[PDB]
Design a protein around this motif. Sequence first.
Motif, PDB file in Angstrom:
ATOM      1  N   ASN A 110       0.740  -1.283   0.034  1.00 34.54           N
ATOM      2  CA  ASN A 110      -0.020   0.067  -0.060  1.00 34.54           C
ATOM      3  C   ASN A 110       0.933   1.214   0.101  1.00 34.54           C
ATOM      4  O   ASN A 110       0.733   2.070  -0.761  1.00 34.54           O
ATOM      5  CB  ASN A 110      -0.878  -0.126   1.079  1.00 34.54           C
ATOM      6  CG  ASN A 110      -2.078  -0.968   1.259  1.00 34.54           C
ATOM      7  OD1 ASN A 110      -2.269  -1.602  -0.143  1.00 34.54           O
ATOM      8  ND2 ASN A 110      -2.810  -1.095   2.013  1.00 34.54           N
ATOM      9  N   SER A 111       1.958   1.303   0.779  1.00 35.92           N
ATOM     10  CA  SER A 111       2.812   2.362   0.874  1.00 35.92           C
ATOM     11  C   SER A 111       3.574   2.593  -0.654  1.00 35.92           C
ATOM     12  O   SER A 111       3.880   3.783  -0.885  1.00 35.92           O
ATOM     13  CB  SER A 111       4.213   2.169   1.929  1.00 35.92           C
ATOM     14  OG  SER A 111       3.488   2.213   3.237  1.00 35.92           O
ATOM     15  N   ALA A 168       1.096   4.104  -2.906  1.00 37.21           N
ATOM     16  CA  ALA A 168       1.169   5.569  -2.343  1.00 37.21           C
ATOM     17  C   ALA A 168       2.350   6.424  -3.171  1.00 37.21           C
ATOM     18  O   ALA A 168       2.211   7.561  -3.528  1.00 37.21           O
ATOM     19  CB  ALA A 168       0.799   5.761  -1.116  1.00 37.21           C
ATOM     20  N   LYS A 189       2.264   6.708  -6.916  1.00 39.60           N
ATOM     21  CA  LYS A 189       1.197   7.978  -7.528  1.00 39.60           C
ATOM     22  C   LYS A 189       1.869   9.323  -7.060  1.00 39.60           C
ATOM     23  O   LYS A 189       1.696   9.977  -7.996  1.00 39.60           O
ATOM     24  CB  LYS A 189      -0.093   7.535  -6.340  1.00 39.60           C
ATOM     25  CG  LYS A 189      -1.126   8.563  -7.123  1.00 39.60           C
ATOM     26  CD  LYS A 189      -2.653   7.671  -6.829  1.00 39.60           C
ATOM     27  CE  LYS A 189      -3.547   8.563  -7.179  1.00 39.60           C
ATOM     28  NZ  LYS A 189      -4.735   8.185  -6.740  1.00 39.60           N
ATOM     29  N   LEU A 200     -10.495   8.537   3.460  1.00 41.13           N
ATOM     30  CA  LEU A 200     -10.877   8.089   4.669  1.00 41.13           C
ATOM     31  C   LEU A 200     -12.045   7.461   5.066  1.00 41.13           C
ATOM     32  O   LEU A 200     -12.557   6.488   5.528  1.00 41.13           O
ATOM     33  CB  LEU A 200     -10.291   8.733   5.893  1.00 41.13           C
ATOM     34  CG  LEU A 200      -8.462   9.280   5.802  1.00 41.13           C
ATOM     35  CD1 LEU A 200      -8.264  10.090   6.938  1.00 41.13           C
ATOM     36  CD2 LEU A 200      -7.800   7.597   5.946  1.00 41.13           C
ATOM     37  N   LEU A 241     -12.201   5.046  -0.410  1.00 38.41           N
ATOM     38  CA  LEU A 241     -11.619   3.829  -0.078  1.00 38.41           C
ATOM     39  C   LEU A 241     -12.348   2.759   0.220  1.00 38.41           C
ATOM     40  O   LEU A 241     -12.381   1.560  -0.107  1.00 38.41           O
ATOM     41  CB  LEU A 241     -10.175   3.982   0.781  1.00 38.41           C
ATOM     42  CG  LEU A 241      -9.239   4.659  -0.053  1.00 38.41           C
ATOM     43  CD1 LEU A 241      -8.136   4.961   0.802  1.00 38.41           C
ATOM     44  CD2 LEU A 241      -8.863   4.072  -1.390  1.00 38.41           C
ATOM     45  N   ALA A 257     -12.900  -0.787  -1.382  1.00 40.69           N
ATOM     46  CA  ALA A 257     -13.037  -2.035  -0.353  1.00 40.69           C
ATOM     47  C   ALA A 257     -14.369  -2.919  -0.534  1.00 40.69           C
ATOM     48  O   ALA A 257     -14.022  -3.994  -0.484  1.00 40.69           O
ATOM     49  CB  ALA A 257     -12.445  -1.571   0.983  1.00 40.69           C
ATOM     50  N   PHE A 310      -4.957  -4.105   3.254  1.00 43.51           N
ATOM     51  CA  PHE A 310      -4.774  -2.914   4.567  1.00 43.51           C
ATOM     52  C   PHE A 310      -5.434  -3.778   5.713  1.00 43.51           C
ATOM     53  O   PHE A 310      -4.845  -3.691   6.848  1.00 43.51           O
ATOM     54  CB  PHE A 310      -5.676  -1.851   4.395  1.00 43.51           C
ATOM     55  CG  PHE A 310      -5.687  -0.819   5.613  1.00 43.51           C
ATOM     56  CD1 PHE A 310      -4.846  -0.272   6.138  1.00 43.51           C
ATOM     57  CD2 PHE A 310      -7.131  -0.903   6.394  1.00 43.51           C
ATOM     58  CE1 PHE A 310      -4.913   0.446   7.378  1.00 43.51           C
ATOM     59  CE2 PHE A 310      -7.375  -0.086   7.447  1.00 43.51           C
ATOM     60  CZ  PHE A 310      -6.069   0.188   8.105  1.00 43.51           C
ATOM     61  N   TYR A 311      -6.630  -4.462   5.561  1.00 45.47           N
ATOM     62  CA  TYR A 311      -7.298  -5.055   6.568  1.00 45.47           C
ATOM     63  C   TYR A 311      -6.581  -6.348   7.138  1.00 45.47           C
ATOM     64  O   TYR A 311      -7.099  -6.886   8.540  1.00 45.47           O
ATOM     65  CB  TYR A 311      -8.769  -5.335   6.233  1.00 45.47           C
ATOM     66  CG  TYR A 311      -9.597  -4.302   6.005  1.00 45.47           C
ATOM     67  CD1 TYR A 311     -10.248  -3.417   7.246  1.00 45.47           C
ATOM     68  CD2 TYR A 311      -9.834  -3.606   4.822  1.00 45.47           C
ATOM     69  CE1 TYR A 311     -10.709  -2.187   7.018  1.00 45.47           C
ATOM     70  CE2 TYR A 311     -10.412  -2.302   4.601  1.00 45.47           C
ATOM     71  CZ  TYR A 311     -10.745  -1.686   5.687  1.00 45.47           C
ATOM     72  OH  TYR A 311     -11.744  -0.543   5.539  1.00 45.47           O
ATOM     73  N   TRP A 330      -7.249   8.313  11.314  1.00 41.92           N
ATOM     74  CA  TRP A 330      -8.326   7.350  11.421  1.00 41.92           C
ATOM     75  C   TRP A 330      -7.991   6.165  12.378  1.00 41.92           C
ATOM     76  O   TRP A 330      -6.749   6.249  12.564  1.00 41.92           O
ATOM     77  CB  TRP A 330      -8.191   6.790   9.954  1.00 41.92           C
ATOM     78  CG  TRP A 330      -9.171   5.620   9.432  1.00 41.92           C
ATOM     79  CD1 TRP A 330     -10.379   5.535   8.919  1.00 41.92           C
ATOM     80  CD2 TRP A 330      -8.906   4.286   9.946  1.00 41.92           C
ATOM     81  NE1 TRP A 330     -11.109   4.460   8.793  1.00 41.92           N
ATOM     82  CE2 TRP A 330      -9.964   3.408   9.397  1.00 41.92           C
ATOM     83  CE3 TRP A 330      -8.106   3.337  10.846  1.00 41.92           C
ATOM     84  CZ2 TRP A 330     -10.369   2.145   9.651  1.00 41.92           C
ATOM     85  CZ3 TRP A 330      -7.967   2.252  10.837  1.00 41.92           C
ATOM     86  CH2 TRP A 330      -9.229   1.608  10.209  1.00 41.92           C
ATOM     87  N   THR A 368       1.615   8.861   4.878  1.00 43.30           N
ATOM     88  CA  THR A 368       0.753   7.879   5.799  1.00 43.30           C
ATOM     89  C   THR A 368       1.555   7.369   6.781  1.00 43.30           C
ATOM     90  O   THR A 368       2.871   6.780   6.486  1.00 43.30           O
ATOM     91  CB  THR A 368       0.036   6.856   4.996  1.00 43.30           C
ATOM     92  OG1 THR A 368      -1.052   7.632   3.989  1.00 43.30           O
ATOM     93  CG2 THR A 368      -0.699   6.054   5.874  1.00 43.30           C
TER      94      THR A 368
END
Length: 207
Positions: free
Chosen positions: A35-36, A39, A42, A87, A91, A95, A122-123, A146, A168
């Motif tokens: 995920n990092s 990001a 991007k 947030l 997403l 998801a 992420f989960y 969050w 993040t």
Amino acid sequence: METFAFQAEIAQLMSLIINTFYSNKEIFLRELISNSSDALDKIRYESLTDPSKLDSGKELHINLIPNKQDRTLTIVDTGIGMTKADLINNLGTIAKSGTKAFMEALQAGADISMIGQFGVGFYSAYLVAEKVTVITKHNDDEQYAWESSAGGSFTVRTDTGEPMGRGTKVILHLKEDQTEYLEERRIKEIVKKHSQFIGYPITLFVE
Ligand SMILES: Cc1cn(-c2ccc(C(N)=O)c(NC3CCC(=O)CC3)c2)c2c1C(=O)CC(C)(C)C2
């Protein structure tokens, strides 16, 4: 601090991750690093047409920070970051479809380690964390915090902590029996096994 309800599909996903007996928990780290990495790709891509997007920081990196006193493992990146809309809504919308596809694949014989293929990696943080805090800063928005201990809800608030510039931080408040992920040897082993070719410097901090 505002409180929100997870959509039924995401609540179901989190309960499956928390409740299913599945020993190969270490895959959480590669999911967060991926995920990092996404990001960072991007912000790097956007900066090619608008160099001022890096005024909030030129460095494109990933830091892994263990804290034995707080029992936390933090995954920090200087990626694009997330807006308030990301947030609370964006997403979660993405998801929802990923969760449905992941659930169907699991019923058909897939494994929890394949979660990232459905864009909901992420989960997987809930394999090892009782609470997850996400501190984030996007160029177009303010710094937000969050947070969720699952149970069907999450919170969002403007963050008053140390300003991040851009990026993040995913803070994993580890479960009492998951402290192995605070050990240098264990994190180094996992990074080498699953995240060895990430195109950004990964620094494993020590204590
Ligand atoms: C799906 C999904 C991905 N992620 C995520 C995590 C971390 C990062 C990160 N480390 O930045 C990230 N980055 C995305 C943002 C949107 C985009 O354009 C691609 C990269 C996404 C999250 C979710 C959630 O449903 C809950 C959440 C919004 C708190 C966090």
